[PDB]
Amino acid sequence: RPFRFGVNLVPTPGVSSWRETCRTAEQSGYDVIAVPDALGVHSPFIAMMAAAAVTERVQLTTFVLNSAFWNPVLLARDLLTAHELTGGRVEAGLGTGYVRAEFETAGLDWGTAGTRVTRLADTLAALRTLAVPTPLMVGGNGDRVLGLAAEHADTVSFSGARMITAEAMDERVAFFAERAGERDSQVERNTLVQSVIATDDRAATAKAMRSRMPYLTAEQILQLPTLLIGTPAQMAETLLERRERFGFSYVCVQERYLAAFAPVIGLLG
Amino acid sequence: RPFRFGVNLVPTPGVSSWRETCRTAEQSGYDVIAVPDALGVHSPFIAMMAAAAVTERVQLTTFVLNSAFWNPVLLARDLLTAHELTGGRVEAGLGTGYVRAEFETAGLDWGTAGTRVTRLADTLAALRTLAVPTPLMVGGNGDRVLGLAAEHADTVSFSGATLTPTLRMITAEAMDERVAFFAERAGERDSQVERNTLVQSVIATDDRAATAKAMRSRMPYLTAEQILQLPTLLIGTPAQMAETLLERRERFGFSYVCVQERYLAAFAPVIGLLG
Ligand SMILES: C[C@H](OP(=O)(O)OC[C@@H](O)[C@@H](O)[C@@H](O)Cn1c2nc(=O)[nH]c(=O)c-2cc2ccc(O)cc21)C(=O)N[C@@H](CCC(=O)N[C@@H](CCC(=O)O)C(=O)O)C(=O)O
């Protein structure tokens, strides 16, 4: 699948630069602006509408909704509206929600880990039953969640982080592919790269980073799917290898790396 | 011909930086500011006047006008006005138009490729008959369009990409044929017509070979060697890029080179070296 690149922007209360930041993302060549779903951050669909007003090309996605925060029928109302009123530019990433303090603050039942996955499952089933027009992404590495992505999702998002080894990712991607079966080729695979480390000596940088990861070898650090290290050409070759190995074609980076990663889009976008 | 360097800027509604952007282009050493003709973009001659008020040296050009948008007599009025009220600093690039939704939004007939090219031909003939004082550029790679450039234009702009009326980059070998086609049509007038091309990407790198290899992902129909010869791409250090542009002026005759707004700063070092 052809590469698509996203940047995870955080619309922050009291910060007045939202429109400018979204323009910079589009002008820098990103294909997708992604926003989170958290307390203390701007509301995601409202922020996406403000982004749509100052951009023309990028897709706009949640990355990812906390299923505990949304009533499925009312979420389907939101998604239909966001689709129609942006001209079809909205996608919806969903996940389980993992911060207990946010449930407590909002007066929601934390339940059990399995109850929180069932909330995601029930939401996915309802959104498909209501035929929402927005493409759906499912994120999370748990067995059941990956099964739900295999069943319902247009895009599956794998977490790379406690950074996951390339060998551990092999096992999660293989587990997903077994669940997806004959659907496998119809599901785009996403991951979020947590750090983009520009360096003219990736070998020395990796060896030095054993300071913060003494439990990994330098080769293991250079193979961590959530880290990209080196020059733009090296980073592009790393992403090409990771698309072959893991199937990852939809790659997101964090806001602080927007400019650091942009040269890679010039080679692969 | 001596090199001339342009940057294609997009004057955008709701973005208050137009004057600042135009001054940066001139201060960075560009010879030309180019603006498009599209719905949703600021109106081209009005944006050009705003640019002329804050710059002193650069030429200002359309790059390129959608011929379906303009009545030839009224366009001649605009061109004479722009010429006199800027002191001779305006040039007009013209093309056929190619985005069907813009025709439809403006209530214009998309028609056929034939009718869109005939509209360009009719407009060029009328502008020459009205003796407009602005230099005229004609852009596009179709046989009829390059024939019109050979007949009428002061500058011919060779497109480095095709797209069903997204972009597919054309090889250096195909560009060789397009330049030779134009030259044959131009005949004795060939040497009086400046040749332009737009570079789509300016990629600063210390490993041009590794860069080109990776870029095959975006252009699977090309080899790395072909990527390094694409006229729409500049790859390497500023010195390597300057040497490439010298080689491409000898191979293709390209002396008027434009880059896209995103690469304004990336390309400016090359201007330093070629001057
Ligand atoms: C559409 C284009 O024809 P062209 O003569 O090369 O260019 C015509 C116009 O697009 C051109 O004159 C300009 O108006 C376009 N143009 C702009 N046009 C505008 O209207 N506004 C602009 O601001 C503008 C800017 C601009 C900047 C640079 C540039 O190079 C062109 C620009 C083209 O891609 N032609 C292909 C043919 C494409 C086609 O018809 N079919 C496809 C599919 C084949 C099939 O399925 O049948 C193909 O042959 O590959 C070709 O010659 O090979």
Task: Write the CATH number for B46.
Answer: 3.20.20.30
Is the distance from the beta carbon of residue B36 to the nearest atom of ligand 1 less than 6 Å?
A: yes
Q: What residues make up the domain containing A224? A: 4-268
With CA atoms as reference, report the closest residue to A57 among A104, A12, A89.
Answer: A89
Angle at A140 between CA A134 and CA A141, to 5 degrees: 140
With CA atoms as reference, report the closest residue to A56 among A7, A89, A19.
Answer: A89
Angle at A250 between CA A18 and CA B161, to 5 degrees: 90
β partners of residue B71? none
Find tokens 């497109």 and name the residue.
B159
The shortest CB-CB distance from A267 to any of B14, B206, B211 is to B211
After which residues does chain A break, using C–N > 2.5 Å?
161
* Distance, first Cα to last Cα, chain B: 14
Q: Pairing state of beta strands A32-35 and A59-66?
A: parallel
Torsion of CA A17, A18, A22, A27, to 10 degrees: -10
Dmax (CA) for chain B in angstroms is 53
Total domains in the fold of chain B: 1
- Which run of H or of E encompasses A9? none
Under an 8 Å CB criterion, which residues of B touch A? 14-15, 40, 201, 203, 205-207, 210-211, 213-215, 217-218, 262
Q: How many CB atoms lie within 10 A of CB A24?
A: 16
| Residue A96 · residue A64 · CB < 8 Å | no
Dihedrals phi, psi of A90, to nearest 5 degrees: -105, 135
Inter-chain touch B40–A54, beta carbons under 8 Å: no
Q: How far is B229 from chain A (nearest CA, A)?
A: 16
- If phi > 0 it is left, if psi is from -120 to 50 it is alpha, else beta; for residue A87 that is left
| Residue B52 · residue B89 · CB < 8 Å | yes
- Residue B189 CA, chain-centre distance (Å), reads 21
Q: How far is B206 from chain A (nearest CA, A)?
A: 9
User: Using CA atoms, how far apart are residues A20 and A27, in angstroms rounded to an integer?
Assistant: 10
Inter-chain touch B217–A266, beta carbons under 8 Å: no
| Residue B5 · residue B262 · CB < 8 Å | no
The shortest CB-CB distance from B214 to any of A28, A54, A237 is to A237
Torsion of CA B212, B214, B217, B219, to 10 degrees: 0
Amino acid at B70: W
The shortest CB-CB distance from B211 to any of A23, A233, A269 is to A233
Residue nearest to atom 32 of ligand 1 (CA): B64
Minimum-distance ligand 1 atom for the alpha carbon of B113: 40
By three-state DSSP, how is residue A25 classified? helix
Amino acid at B84: E
User: Using CA atoms, how far apart are residues B200 and B233, in angstroms rounded to an integer?
Assistant: 6
Find tokens 């080729």 and name the residue.
A185
- Residue B243 CA, chain-centre distance (Å), reads 21
Residue-wise over B21-50: b if at least 16 C-beta within 10 A, else e? Answer: bbebbbebbbbbbbbbbeeeebebbebbbb
| Residue A114 · residue A81 · CB < 8 Å | no
Task: A145-148: list long-range contacts, CB under 8 Å, 24+ apart.
Answer: A145/A95, A145/A96, A145/A117, A145/A120, A146/A172, A146/A175, A146/A176, A146/A179, A147/A179, A148/A117, A148/A120, A148/A121, A148/A124
Residues of A in contact with B214 (CB under 8 A): 233, 236-237, 240, 267-268
Find tokens 């179709």 and name the residue.
B142
β partners of residue B197? B158, B257
Q: Which residues are within 8 A (CB) of A202 and not within 5 positions of it... i.e. 6 or more apart?
A: A222, A229, A230, A231, A234
- If phi > 0 it is left, if psi is from -120 to 50 it is alpha, else beta; for residue B60 that is beta
By three-state DSSP, how is residue A76 classified? helix
- This structure's resolution (Å) is 1.8
User: Using CA atoms, how far apart are residues A253 and B164, in angstroms rounded to an integer?
Assistant: 33
β partners of residue B236? B204
Inter-chain touch A237–B215, beta carbons under 8 Å: no
Inter-chain touch A240–B217, beta carbons under 8 Å: yes
User: Using CA atoms, how far apart are residues A51 and A86, in angstroms rounded to an integer?
Assistant: 10
DSSP chain B: ---EEEEE----TT---HHHHHHHHHHTT-SEEEE---TTS--HHHHHHHHHTT-SS-EEEEEEEEGGG--HHHHHHHHHHHHHHHTS-EEEEEE----HHHHHHTT-----HHHHHHHHHHHHHHHHHTT-SS-EEEE--SHHHHHHHHHH-SEEEE-SEE-----EEPPHHHHHHHHHHHHHHHGGGGGGSEEEEEESEEEE-S-HHHHHHHHTTT-TTS-HHHHHH-TTEEEE-HHHHHHHHHHHHHHH---EEEEEGGGHHHHHHHHHHT-
With CA atoms as reference, report the closest residue to A221 among A148, A153, A165, A266.
Answer: A165
Residues of A in contact with B15 (CB under 8 A): 23
User: Using CA atoms, how far apart are residues A136 and A6, in angstroms rounded to an integer?
Assistant: 15
Under an 8 Å CB criterion, which residues of A touch B? 3, 23, 27-29, 54, 56, 231-234, 236-237, 240, 266-269
With CA atoms as reference, report the closest residue to A251 among A211, A194, A177, A170.
Answer: A194
- Residue A222 CA, chain-centre distance (Å), reads 21
Tokens linked to A56 = 């023309």
Inter-chain touch A231–B40, beta carbons under 8 Å: no
